[PDB]
Design a protein around this ligand. Structure first.
Ligand SMILES: [Mg+2]
Ligand SMILES: [Mg+2]
Ligand SMILES: [Mg+2]
Ligand SMILES: [Mg+2]
Lengths: 49, 97, 834
RNA sequence: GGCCAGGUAGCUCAGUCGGUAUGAGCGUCCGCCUGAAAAGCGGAAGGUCGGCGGUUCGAUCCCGCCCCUGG
């Protein structure tokens, strides 16, 4: 739920993967693992990464 | 440390000692005594400061060509010994892993 | 970017309009702001000063010459018949200026006691103070010059300067742009303290100015995302007028320098209401003002006299002559207010938040206006903020407000800026908070923050106010109820977590490997993914080496380290150099982390809509576009493997120590590995083993190549090992040992083989021929003496035979030994020692 | 983004705006010494003075670009 072109996302300075606009980066948090677990596992989920 | 006779003498003394070194450890000794700060070719560049200003451009040019001669012979000799070392590590230091 | 600074006195004043007499300590105010969600980065009190600190007027200036710097002997009127002679080094003041004087006996911030001094051959009876010396501001170049009429000579300096005030430095989260002003912060305090709030932007506080016609011709392209564009002129302002001290001081305490009334009022109103304002010199406008996207390759010079390259996504204000402003970022120097400006046209506009964000970030202009527009500015208060500016500017600079107004509000004009209503159950905040809130708490709190609440049985219909575009879903409303009621009331109950499966086999193996290596003498590090500069050039790898295919970072902290690690050794060797270079020369390190091994160029995937679950094919596509990231275990060794002591001088690191590190990892993983000779940089090609689990390669180990050691500044004889843990299968063996009660037979067999024959191959040949009677085999001698031919070696194994059902004879054991020798002769060409 | 100040031996730091950094402390090596050590005393090695170019007979020093710091 990060808003695009917004200080909630732009001010989150990130190691972006070259070239520019690759939509690939080094994760600023392990939160994308929580997205993968919700897509992979069945409910209920009680997970730690 | 003046005439080209004194420069060619030190270059040949440095060049023949460079061609004599067969191991990398020996070439390190030659680098100290023939290219280091206490070497004859280094003392020739140190004497360029006590020379009159009108003579630094002429004498300094003869020192650079002499230093580049011994420096070029050192680099090619260092590459030759490094090439021999790299080609000999397989057999001369092989073990049963 | 999220900083907001304001003095407590100003904040208290706005709150006190609807809560007369309201006043709290700075300590309590900080806790209240923290309790409702506003980070207080710093609480900076002003001053303090003590003793005679008074307002003075410079009555004369004598220039003391002949010194290292210009020095002034000043006669200062402090309100009595005896003027004071004060030596001052500053030069930013003239005769007749109002200054702040610290007389002998006064105390300035920091225990600086003031007394008479004998400076520059003169007697100084005090000092003229700077803003920094009074702890009022950061200005230390010159001394503080109060604007004319601010006070009379003799007035108490602390009272005039308001040194009892306190400045609050707040970090505002990007969802609360309305708090980027005294208006929003005062409203928050009215909610937290259950007070009546009088909106400083309401018509009662800013009564509407007359509307008798258009103020300026205007063409607006609605595709630019502009929501409102209002203009009102102020004619006949005095170019000599200065902003009063109360206005210059509040700007100062908020971190804005005063310049001229026209600009000071626009900045003041922006701080007060949150609506950025801008003042144009109307006499420098040529024709119709136009709001449109910039064209390809269009440029403009901004307020600071710097030319900017514009994009077709940038919104501009132009006329018939040039560009007047970069919409929502900064105005241009063309229509900029100057010292001789007499007729001002004020700009009150609402820009698209995303458009301003892209433009200010591309141009690196985080101005006060831009960082407010990108967090959404309340579009309903435009004309209110406009009328506030026009009335205040005309009053200060002796101008006159023109009764004309242009107010573009879209096609068709929008006369109601209410967001869409939200439906939410009355007890939804109660469920998420886990607290049974009192009756009507949700509706009361939502009404406090400005929303319209209507009841429909148990379902609330909530319409958030125009200054709260962050309130879009019921969850947003839940946060408002919970934060105002306080998160401290939420109880602590542990959730019903089901019967979990615990650690996976891979996570359990990762621990066992770490425990084993640490118990064997290795020290774990945390490897960095950024490779050292030119590490593969030092290793002498070929240009087509797969380890060179690395993923590169666009914005690394070091421009010479952009590539991600395809191997763990460069990070381990870097930590190995750090230890050895600092006196710890006998070191053994290991690391267990992932690598980044791309199989193609950097290929991205377009945005998948987040209003739905991605399909299983879309999830697989996102995974395939990512580089392979297997988990590796690696280790490096140098110096002594075993330290010296009362037993002996210790043993240096050798290649066999790295080979044993493989078997330590293999035993921890409960897999069987084989080591085979291989050539693989950066290892020593004659002391390099390739590790196999079955017939699958999992890594290498041994001594590093001496040329790599030289070019990398490593210790001589440094050894290393790197394994691919993902390439090693997780095993779950179930042994069923059968212990035989019968005695064993011990025999030794000596075999002569070629030098190149691996000792393991000889043992495998002996094992294959001996049969099931062979219980254990162990090599204990390798002899290459003179009685052994050149390029040959003698190997002697200790054999242990035992039958499961009988006692053997020496002939029975010798039959298996002779069968083992025949197998060794057939498989590795062994000859029985003789 | 500014003019500045910096990056110097294995570690921590001095110092030089053209021909030797006589660099320091500690680290490394040799000798006397000890059964073997260390200290002590006496000897040495090691920097390509951040990188890539340019100017010059010659650059740690001058000029340009760039990398990484402090303010
Ligand atoms: Mg925080
Ligand atoms: Mg919220
Ligand atoms: Mg250092
Ligand atoms: Mg000694």
């Amino acid at each position: 739920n990060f808003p695009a072109d917004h200080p909630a996302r732009g001010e989150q300075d990130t190691f972006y993967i070259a070239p520019e606009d690759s939509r690939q980066l080094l994760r600023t948090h392990t939160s994308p693992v929580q997205i993968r677990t919700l897509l992979a596992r069945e409910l209920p989920v009680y997970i730690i990464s | 440390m003046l005439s080209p006779e004194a420069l060619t003498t030190a270059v040949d003394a440095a060049q023949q000692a460079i061609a004599l070194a067969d191991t990398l450890d020996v070439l390190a000794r030659v680098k100290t005594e023939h290219l280091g700060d206490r070497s004859p070719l280094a003392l020739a560049r140190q004497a360029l400061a006590v020379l009159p200003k009108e003579q630094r451009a002429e004498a300094g040019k003869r020192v650079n060509a002499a230093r580049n001669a011994a420096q070029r012979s050192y680099d090619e000799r260092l590459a030759t010994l490094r090439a021999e070392r790299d080609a000999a590590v397989l057999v001369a230091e092989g073990i049963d892993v | 970017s999220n900083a907001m600074r304001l003095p407590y006195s100003w904040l208290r004043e706005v709150v006190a309009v609807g809560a007369s007499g309201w006043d709290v300590t700075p300590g309590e105010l900080e806790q209240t702001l923290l309790r409702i969600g506003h980070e207080v980065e710093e609480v900076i009190p002003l001053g303090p000063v003590d003793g005679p600190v008074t307002v003075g007027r410079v009555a004369d200036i004598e220039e003391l010459t002949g010194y290292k710097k210009p020095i002034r002997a000043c006669a200062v009127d402090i309100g009595d018949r005896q003027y004071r002679e004060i030596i001052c080094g500053a030069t930013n003041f003239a005769v007749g200026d109002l200054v702040v004087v610290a007389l002998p006996g006064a105390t300035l911030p920091g225990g600086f006691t003031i007394s008479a001094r004998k400076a520059y051959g003169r007697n100084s009876d005090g000092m003229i103070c700077s803003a920094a010396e009074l702890n009022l501001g950061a200005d230390h170049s010159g001394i503080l010059v109060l604007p004319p009429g601010a006070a009379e000579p003799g007035a108490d300096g602390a009272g005039v300067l308001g040194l009892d005030d306190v400045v609050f430095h707040l970090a505002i989260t990007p969802d609360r742009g309305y708090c980027m002003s005294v208006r929003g912060l005062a409203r928050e305090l009215a909610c937290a303290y259950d007070l009546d709030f009088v909106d400083p932007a309401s018509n009662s506080r800013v009564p509407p100015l007359p509307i008798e016609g258009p103020a300026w011709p205007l063409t607006v392209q609605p595709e630019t995302g502009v929501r409102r564009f209002a203009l009102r002129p102020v004619i006949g302002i005095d170019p000599a007028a200065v902003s009063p001290w109360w206005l210059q001081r509040r700007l100062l305490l908020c971190g804005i320098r005063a310049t001229c009334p026209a600009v000071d009022v626009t900045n003041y109103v922006m701080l007060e209401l949150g609506h950025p304002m801008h003042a144009h010199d109307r006499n420098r406008i040529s024709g119709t003002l136009g709001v449109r996207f910039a064209r390809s390759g269009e440029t403009a010079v901004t307020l600071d006299g710097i030319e900017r390259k514009l994009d077709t996504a940038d919104v501009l204000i132009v006329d018939d002559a040039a560009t007047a402003a970069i919409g929502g970022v900064m105005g241009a120097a063309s229509t900029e207010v100057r010292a001789d400006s007499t007729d001002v046209l004020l700009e009150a506009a609402i820009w698209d938040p995303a458009a301003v964000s892209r433009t200010q970030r591309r141009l690196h202009l985080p101005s006060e206006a831009a960082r407010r527009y990108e967090r959404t500015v309340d579009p309903a208060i435009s004309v209110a903020a406009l009328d506030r500016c026009a009335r205040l500017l005309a009053d200060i600079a002796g101008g006159e407000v023109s009764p004309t107004l242009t107010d573009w509000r879209g096609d068709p004009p929008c006369d109601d800026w209410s967001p869409p209503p939200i439906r939410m159950g009355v007890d939804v905040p109660d469920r998420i908070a886990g607290v049974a809130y009192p009756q009507g708490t949700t509706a009361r709190r939502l009404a406090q923050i400005g929303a319209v609440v209507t009841h429909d049985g148990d379902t609330l219909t909530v319409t958030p106010p125009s200054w709260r575009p962050d309130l879009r879903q019921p969850a947003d409303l839940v946060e408002e109820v919970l934060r105002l009621e306080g998160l401290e009331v939420i109880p602590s109950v542990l959730p019903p977590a089901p019967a979990g499966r615990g650690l996976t086999a891979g996570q359990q193996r990762r621990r066992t490997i770490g425990r084993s290596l640490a118990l064997s003498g290795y020290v774990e590090i945390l490897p960095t993914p950024f490779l050292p500069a030119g590490v593969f050039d030092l290793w002498g790898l070929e240009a087509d080496d797969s380890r060179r295919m690395t993923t590169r970072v666009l914005n690394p902290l070091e421009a010479d380290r952009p590539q991600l690690a395809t191997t763990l050794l460069p990070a381990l060797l870097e930590a190995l150099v750090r230890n050895v270079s600092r006196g710890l020369v006998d070191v053994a390190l290991f690391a267990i982390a992932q690598v980044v091994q791309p199989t193609e160029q950097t290929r991205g995937v377009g945005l998948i809509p987040v209003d739905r679950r991605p399909t299983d094919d879309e999830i697989a596509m996102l995974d395939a576009s990512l580089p392979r990231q297997p988990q590796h275990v690696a280790a490096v060794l140098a110096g002594l493997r075993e330290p010296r002591g009362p037993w002996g001088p210790g043993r240096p690191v050798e290649a066999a120590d790295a080979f044993e590190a493989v078997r330590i990892i293999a035993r921890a993983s409960r897999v069987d590995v084989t080591l085979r000779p291989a050539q693989y940089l950066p290892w020593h090609p004659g002391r390099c083993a390739q590790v196999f689990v079955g017939e699958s390669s999992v890594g290498h180990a041994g001594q590093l190549h001496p040329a790599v050691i030289e070019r990398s500044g490593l210790p001589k004889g440094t050894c290393a090992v790197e394994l691919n843990l993902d390439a090693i299968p997780c095993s779950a063996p179930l042994p069923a040992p059968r212990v035989s009660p019968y005695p064993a037979v011990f025999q030794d067999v000596s075999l002569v083989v070629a030098a190149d024959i691996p000792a393991q191959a000889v043992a495998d040949a002996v094992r294959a021929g001996a049969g099931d009677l062979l219980e254990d085999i162990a090599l204990f001698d390798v002899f290459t003496g003179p009685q052994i031919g050149e390029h040959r070696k003698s190997l002697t194994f200790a054999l242990r035979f035992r039958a499961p059902d009988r006692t053997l004879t020496e002939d029975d054991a010798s039959a298996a030994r002779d069968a083992a020798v025949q197998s060794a002769a057939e498989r590795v060409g062994a000859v029985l020692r003789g």
